[PDB]
Amino acid sequence: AVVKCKPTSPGRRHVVKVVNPELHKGKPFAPLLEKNSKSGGRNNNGRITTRHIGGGHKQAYRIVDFKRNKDGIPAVVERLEYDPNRSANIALVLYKDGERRYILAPKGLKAGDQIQSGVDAAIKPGNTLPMRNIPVGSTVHNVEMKPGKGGQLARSAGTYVQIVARDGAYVTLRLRSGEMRKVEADCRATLGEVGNAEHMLRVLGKAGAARWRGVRPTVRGTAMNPVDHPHGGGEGRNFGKHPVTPWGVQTKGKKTRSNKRTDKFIVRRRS
Amino acid sequence: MKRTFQPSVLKRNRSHGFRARMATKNGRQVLARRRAKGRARLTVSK
RNA sequence: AGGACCGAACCGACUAAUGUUGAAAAAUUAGCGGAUGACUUGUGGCUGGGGGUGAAAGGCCAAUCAAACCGGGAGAUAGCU
RNA sequence: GCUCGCCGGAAGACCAAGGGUUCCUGUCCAACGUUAAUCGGGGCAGGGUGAGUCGACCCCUAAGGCGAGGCCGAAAGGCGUAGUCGAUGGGAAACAGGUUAAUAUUCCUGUACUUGGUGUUACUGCGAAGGGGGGACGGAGAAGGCUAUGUUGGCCGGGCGACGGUUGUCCCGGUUUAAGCGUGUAGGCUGGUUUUCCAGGCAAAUCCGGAAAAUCAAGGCUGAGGCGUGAUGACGAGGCACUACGGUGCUGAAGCAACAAAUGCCCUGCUUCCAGGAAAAGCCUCUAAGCAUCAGGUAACAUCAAAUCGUACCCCAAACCGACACAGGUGGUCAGGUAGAGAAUACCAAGGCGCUUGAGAGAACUCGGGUGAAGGAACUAGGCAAAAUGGUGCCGUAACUUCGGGAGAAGGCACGCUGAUAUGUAGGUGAGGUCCCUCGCGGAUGGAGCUGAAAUCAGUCGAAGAUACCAGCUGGCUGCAACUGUUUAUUAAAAACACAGCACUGUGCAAACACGAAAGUGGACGUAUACGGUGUGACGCCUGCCCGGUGCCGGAAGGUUAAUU
RNA sequence: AAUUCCUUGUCGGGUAAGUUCCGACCUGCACGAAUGGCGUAAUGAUGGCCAGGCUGUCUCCACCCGAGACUCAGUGAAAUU
Structure with missing residues (x-):
């Protein structure tokens, strides 16, 4: 939770931090790692295009399933690992077939819950299915604008999107910034909030x-x-x-x- | 105090060597000019 | 535990004196600040001039910079000496 | 040659980079060396660098470079896939002793080790441009075992002191040994075995992963250090003979124990924290096609092979960077004794040096210092400078406060040496014996020896006991900046910049924006809890009023208005 | 006030004597609210002022110790004209 640090030093007086005890401690799943070099804000011409970027602690990239196309097979979540690449935690799921993957952590998810993806999946926080099936008026996240492209919107921690109407082959969503946007109705999404x-x-x-x-x-x-x-x-x-x-x-x-x-x-x- | 010339043979070769010059056509032009002037050594080498 | 304290190596240059034809085209001497960090250092690589970079002084870019160096237009022009 | 002085976490020793004969021998003082010069890093001549294990070379790869095809561009060309290069990183192996004027993990001695080839032998599933494993990785913190190493006590060999004593609790010296080999310890990590199945790992798999059973409560992996061996060896204080007087030839005793102990090792270990901590190859395993007696693989034996390049010398400086034989700069490795917390500091060890002009004398004046009657800032722009405090333990300590601090506030007290407490205490260290057993580098006891703070009391010397070196002046009012930090290399370090925090504003992803005539790249392998720009700049109380002017935002069909017609 | 010309404004504190300092008055030449207003613990090689200790800063300098300055031997410049 939110914790303040007492003012033992001026560089410590105003420090407020969030510490999660449930997050797993230990090295992450090696087969899902890959190197990620930092650029410093300079393009292939060696010229600074964006400013105020450089330095920082070394980081390693982690592969996250933004598509969730592995349908028909349930999976069990093992732990909620910490991701330095983004702002939201990532859950390590294992399918009943032994395949391991990383997903965004939905709110209210703990180690042990069941997860299902597909057109006929049950309506519960985390399940993935196209808006052909979700009832009108619910809150989802990790949505996409083109089928099969992978999750594209509302991916930062704590955000979501609210569906308001389905007209024919297009549905309407209220984005986190307040925009009212049409989108094709055969795009899949994940229920609940990040x-x-x-x-x-x-x-x-x-x-x-x-x-x-x-x-x-x-x-x-x-x-x-x-x-x-x-x-x-x-x-x-x-x-x-x-x-x-x-x-x-x-x-x-x-x-x-x-x-x-x-x-x-x-x-x-x-x- | 620390002054400009800090020798480094590898950097010298890679920045003014024969191959480094000839890699581009500007270096070829420089080599041709030096040959026309008849300089003793075309570039830095052993 | 701490961009925590005192203080060596390390980094920097606040005061005074000498030196200024200097042991030095920016030192030395006695003090001085930081000293687990926004720290410091070795090697290699990238960013090319009306451009680069700059916790930003018009600062740095090979003892130089309110527009680098070399070559050329070029015996520029000079109602001035 | 004798004496003196200096350095000695260096002015000592070894490298890297860089330089190239500056290294050694003989020979000369023409020119160089800030004076002489028989000398030299000078001039001439000759000599000197030995590798299967050390580096380079070689296998792999990061940042990045080049880049068939390809995209784009007046031309020149830019970017990029397949791919190839590119260490500052990953990958096999030698130790000790002895010799030259100059080489030595390279030459010699003894003792090793690695890799590949060939053949013989016995067994026999072999096979990848593919799949798994591992290589393979952050900071800070703590503490148990060690070792380097030093000290002491014994042991051996010497010695009896120029001047009072100095056969003994007296003085001097030494009391040394590697790699490999076996042993598997302190210690750290992990349940194991078997069977049966499975939308996964591009196909495949007995391999990995997943699931279901049965069975056992040990079973593997790692691992400093210690012991034995290596090693009846070498070395060895010395002694003996020549000293072509430099050195040479012989010979050569003792070669133990206790304590202390690293920033080095166990440790790429353990605990803990958020800012969440390279890649690939070598190595093990699975199979694909293919091949099957083969071929190939496996194990033992013997044999051969391990190419080429560097190896001299300086390397915190007279050899490198600075026009100089320049008070300047230059990365890494080793780190004795005494006192001390210390890699500070003062004196020494090994070792290395007295800095390439001298000799006299003791004017003014200048420079670097020492002392100083009484006054004590009266000097001055200004206590500039100088002077002054300065350590450990204990006692004691205000306003204000963001309760952390202020604060080492202020201020005060004790400090040497000798004896006893205690013939060396507390404490630490710990053998011989004793017993038990897992008979082992095993377990309990047991205390010999060894080491040993601190405190109390009594006495005693000096003017002075934190005696040297080293080692905070303190308080009160107040402007600015919240704080750490950064800046005008070379006259300005600040009230300047930055900063955490706050506000507005734009951006729905092929995002906004930016570099690009363009492909393209950053933004970002991110998705409004995010990103860009601007303004202010902890924290607390707050942030009146004005939309006329100028900008920005939303509408105009009212008017004016282009290319066209 | 880092504003304020007239201004060394006026009063009070501090000194024997205070154009500097602190606290108020307010007649703000010419403060003022995110090119932010007011205050603020701690912090600063930061600006200003006042105390105690300390002393050659000074009253007013005196003596001594070393390197030069002087002499002898050797080598042996420069600016300018």
Whole structure:
């Protein structure tokens, strides 16, 4: 749960952390590991395209079944392992046929529950089945926009999506950002919500905690010099412009979505 | 104090060697220019 | 346990004196700060100039930088000495 | 040659990188060496570097490079699949002693080990560009056994002291040995065996995984260290003979025990924490096609083979980087004694040095220091500088407070040596015997020896007992920044930047954005609890009012309005 | 106030004597609310002020110890003109 650390040191005064006792301790399943090198924000041209990225603790990638197409065979969850790659915990399932896989951890799941995937699977938190079958009005997660493409939306910890209507071959969902979006009705999804919901309440406390995760410091525009950034320099503290990006695009209000191809699927833009 | 030239034969060969120069056509142009000028040593080597 | 304390190696340069034709084209001497970390170091690799990088001083990019070095336009032009 | 002084977690020894004969011998002082120079890293001549086990080479691979085909681009070309390269990482094996002026895990002696080939022999399921296993991996913390090593006591060989004593609880020296081989210990890890099935591991599998039974309560894996062997060997203080006076030839006793103990080993171990900690090959196993007497595999024996390149010298400096024989810089390895917490510090050991101009004299003045009557900041922009405090144990310690702190606040007390407590106590260490058995590197007892803080009391010396070195000035009011941190290499380290936190804002994934004439790449193998941009910058109380101006957002069919017609 | 020209504003504290310091008045030339307002424990090689100890900073310098400066032998520059 959420725990505060007492102020023994200034770098420790404001530290608040979430500790889960149930998470398994020990090395993860080796056959599901693979190397993952960090880039530092530089593309194949060796040029920095994204800023504030670099350093951080070394990490290894873990293979997660975002498709869940292995239907007809039940499985038992063994443990809830910790994933440094993402924000949500990952459960290690074993199918009745001895095949081991990793999945996102739904809320309310403990070691021992049954799991089933398929068109005829039972309605319970975690089961996977296309919206041809889910009753209208429920909460799911790990949804996809194209069949067989794998889970694509609402994958961060603590999030979900709410289904509101099925019209013919298209259903309508209310995304976490508030958008009302159409989607093809033969896409599969997982019922329930993603676990580790209290991920919000952590407080980093000190800059070293952020740096452990590989994020470089950000330099304010208003203190810069004129030659590099439009917000420019000047004596004292002078701003006297309208806020703008480093490349000259005005911020604080300007829309940027210009994809006329997929505008047919949006029913209501977020408000 | 620590100053500019810190010798390293491997770096020297890989940055100014015969093969490194000739890998691209600019290096070929440099080699041709040195040959025309008639320099004693075309590039750094043993 | 601690971006916890005192303090060697290690890193840095706050004060004073000398030196400034210097043992040195930025030292030395006596003090000084950090010293399990946002730490420091070896080797190799990548980022090329109106560009790179920059916890951001117009700082660094081979003793140089409000636009590097070499070669060329080029015997630029000079109502000035 | 004798004496003196200095360094000695170095100014000692060995490498890496880098340099290339600077290494040794003979020979000369033309030029170089900040003076002489018979000397030299100088000049000339000659000599010197020996590898199946050490590195390179070689098998594999990360960051990354190149890249058939391919995509894209006026041309030149950019990116990338198959693939190939690329260590700073993974992969087999030699020890001790002796010799040159210059080489030595390379030459010699003795004792080893690894890999591959060939043949003989006996048995015989062999087979991969495929599947499994393993290789194969974070930080911090703790403590039991060890070892290096040192000290002491014995042992052996010497000695009786230039000046008071100095046959003994006196002084000096030594009291050493590897790899491999067997032993499998302290200790760590894991139940084992058999049978029967199975939508999985691209097919296949007896292999892995999963399921169901029966059976046993030990059974494997790992493992420092110790003992034996190696080793009747070598070495060995010395002594003996020549000293072509450098060295050479012989010979050569004792060669034990206790205690202490590493940052090294067990330990790639154990506990614990979140920031969740390379890859591939060698090695073991499964089968696919194929081959079956074969072929091939297995085990023993004998035999052959293990190519090439580097091996001199300096390597915290006179040889490297700095125009210099330059007070500067340069990664790793080993780490004695005394006191001490210490790799600090002062004096020494092994070892290495006195820094390539000297000799006189004792003006002003300058530089680095020592002391100083009385005053004690009166100096000055400013206590700049200098002066001053400084250790261990114990007692005692305010306001404020985010209850953590402040705080080592402040402040005070004891500190040497000798005797006794106690002929060396507490404590630690621990054999011989005794018994039992698992007869083993076994178990209980048992205390010999060995080592040994701290404290009390009594006495005693000095002016001075934390005597040297080493080793915080303290308090009060107050502006700024919450704090650790970063910055103008080379006049500015800060009230500047950053930071955790807060707010707005854009982005529904082929995301926004950014580098690219383009393919493409980052974002991100992430999916609104996420990502980008801007503003402020812990925490607490808060964050009035104004939409006229300028921007941004939502609508215009009212007006004006382009290419076209 | 790191604001404030007039201004060394006025009063109080501190000193024998205080344009600096602290606490108030308010007539804010020309503060003010996320280019943030007010306060804040702890922290700072940070700015300002005041005490005790300490002393050659000073009153006012005196003596001594070493390296130069002087002499002799040897080698043997430079700026400028």
